[PDB]
Amino acid sequence: SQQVEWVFIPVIKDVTYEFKVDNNDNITELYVNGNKLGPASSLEMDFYFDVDVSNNQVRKFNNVFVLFGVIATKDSNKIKMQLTLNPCDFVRGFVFPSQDPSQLNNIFASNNKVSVSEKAFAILNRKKEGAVSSTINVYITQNTYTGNTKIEKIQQNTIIIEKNTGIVFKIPNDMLNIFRYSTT
């Protein structure tokens, strides 16, 4: 599973992230703005979310990756990330083991990707993260951003976790505050 491409997926405003969870509590698909991303490895739901199954609620997000010196924006229907090298800039998100990387081109504004050491990222609420590869693919444009940046928050229903039963896990609104990021 460490021989698979793991990719960084920024969680940003006006993009919807839908995780499909099966009867075994495994993630079968991630849809980013409706674009399907299949997992290469069997992928436990608890790699991303700690769920209180009894009242159908997310307790916390696990393995939230933070990359510094970059900003993110929405460009057309795609995620655009740019290098600033300013340590006060950051973009937060998930890592995902792509079964079929060619699916990633619909999600990101650039074809341009670089490998970044896994040690470069801060990882919040680390849990059973040994599966992740030692380098992470990051989709970043070739053009630096040198203008002013600001911190933005995501919207209430940015992340949706859909079980096979049709029932969604509740995510409290305050929990989304962990996904703040730098943008233009």
Instruction: Give contact residues for a second copy (rule: CB under 8 A).
Output: 67-70, 83-87, 114-117, 119-120, 134-135, 138, 143-147
**Closer CB to a second copy, 62 or 182, in the complex:** 182
**Closer CB to a second copy, 70 or 176, in the complex:** 70
| Amino acid of residue 77 | N
Closest distance to a second copy from the beta carbon of 183 (Å)? 15
Handedness of CA 56, 29, 79, 15 (dihedral sign): negative
C-beta atoms surrounding 25 within 10 Å: 12
**Closer CB to a second copy, 88 or 167, in the complex:** 88
**Closer CB to a second copy, 96 or 145, in the complex:** 145
Q: How many Å apart are CA 158 and CA 178, to the nearest integer?
A: 13
Closest distance to a second copy from the beta carbon of 179 (Å)? 19
Q: How many Å apart are CA 105 and CA 108, to the nearest integer?
A: 6
Q: How many Å apart are CA 126 and CA 100, to the nearest integer?
A: 25
Closest distance to a second copy from the beta carbon of 122 (Å)? 8
In degrees to the nearest 10, what's the CA dihedral of 107, 34, 14, 116? -30
Closest distance to a second copy from the beta carbon of 176 (Å)? 24
Closest distance to a second copy from the beta carbon of 85 (Å)? 5
Residue 115: which residues within 8 A CB-CB, separation 6 or more? 135, 136, 137, 138
- Rounded alpha-carbon distances, angstroms, from residue 90 to 46, 142, 163: 24, 17, 31
**Closer CB to a second copy, 87 or 130, in the complex:** 87
